[PDB]
């Protein structure tokens, strides 16, 4: 599994982990410092843009979501849920958003409490934050897992590490100036 040597590979796959392609684009990148989104708990996060042409990654995500659901059933039993009844992580950029960067892409909102490791093409840690930013292309490690919290339930996406591949045009961020400034009275 993963980057293991084929001869010495683990007996079982990690069914819930997916590493996205080199054509993955980062949106709303919060990998160097964590932030609160809509008053939520402060977390590292990124919206990972997966081209609709990346069938290998999409198929891997679909299989991982199913495996997450199955692992949730193995933990606590009961009947498998109807997928229309729960929150699922692979979102459609063409119909759920109105942003040009999202056209022709699926997206996943990945987050973690702890910081990701952010590395270059040679798998060395990146020592200049200006190399990774919203709009660049990077592989992202993702782990899918069952959850229930905040009035929602389904399958969530944990953010793992990030491997920068190539520059892209910078993307604008969320409208969060009120986190820095007060009304001047």
The total count of helices amounts to: 1
Q: Biggest sheet, in brief?
A: 4 strands, mixed
Helix content: 10-25%
Q: Strand content of the residues, in percent?
A: 25-35%
In whole angstroms, how far apart are the ends?
Answer: 59 Å
CATH topology: OB fold (Dihydrolipoamide Acetyltransferase, E2P)
Would you mind describing this structure in some detail?
The structure is a monomer. This protein is globular. The protein has one domain (1-185): Nucleic acid-binding proteins (OB fold (Dihydrolipoamide Acetyltransferase, E2P)), CATH 2.40.50.140. It has 185 residues and is mainly beta. Strands 1-7-8-6 form a 4-stranded mixed β-sheet. A 4-stranded antiparallel β-sheet has the order 2-3-5-4. The protein is built from 1 helix and 8 strands, in the order βββαβββββ. The chain has one helix spanning 55-76; strands at 17-19, 25-35, 43-51, 91-92, 105-112, 118-119, 137-149, 152-166. Pfam families: Enc34_ssDNA-bd (PF10991). This is Phage-related protein.
What are the defining features of this structure?
monomer; 185 residues; mainly beta; OB fold (Dihydrolipoamide Acetyltransferase, E2P); 4-stranded mixed β-sheet; 4-stranded antiparallel β-sheet; 1 helix
What can be said about this structure in brief?
Helices cover 12% and strands 34% of the residues. The chain has one helix at residues 55-76, and strands spanning 17-19, 25-35, 43-51, 91-92, 105-112, 118-119, 137-149, 152-166. The strands form two sheets. It has a four-stranded mixed beta sheet with strand order 1-7-8-6. A four-stranded antiparallel beta sheet has the order 2-3-5-4.
């Amino acid at each position: 599994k993963g980057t293991e040597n084929l001869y010495f590979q683990s007996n079982a796959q990690n069914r819930t982990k997916v590493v996205t392609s080199v054509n993955t684009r980062l949106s709303y990148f919060h990998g160097w410092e964590p932030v609160s989104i809509n008053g939520g708990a402060e977390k590292y996060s990124v919206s990972v843009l997966i081209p609709k042409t990346d069938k290998e990654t999409i198929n891997a995500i679909n299989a991982a979501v199913d495996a997450a659901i199955e692992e949730g059933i193995a933990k606590f039993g009961g009947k498998k849920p109807n997928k229309a009844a729960i929150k699922l992580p692979l979102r459609d950029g063409d119909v759920e958003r109105d942003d040009e960067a999202y056209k022709g892409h699926y997206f996943v909102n990945a987050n973690s409490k702890t910081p990701p490791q952010i590395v270059d093409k040679a798998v060395r840690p990146i020592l200049d934050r200006n190399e990774v930013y919203s709009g660049c292309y990077a592989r992202v490690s993702l782990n899918f897992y069952a959850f229930n919290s905040n009035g929602n339930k389904g399958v969530a996406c944990g953010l793992g590490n990030i491997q920068k591949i190539r520059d892209g045009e910078p993307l604008g961020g969320r409208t969060n100036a009120a986190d820095d400034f007060t009304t001047i009275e």
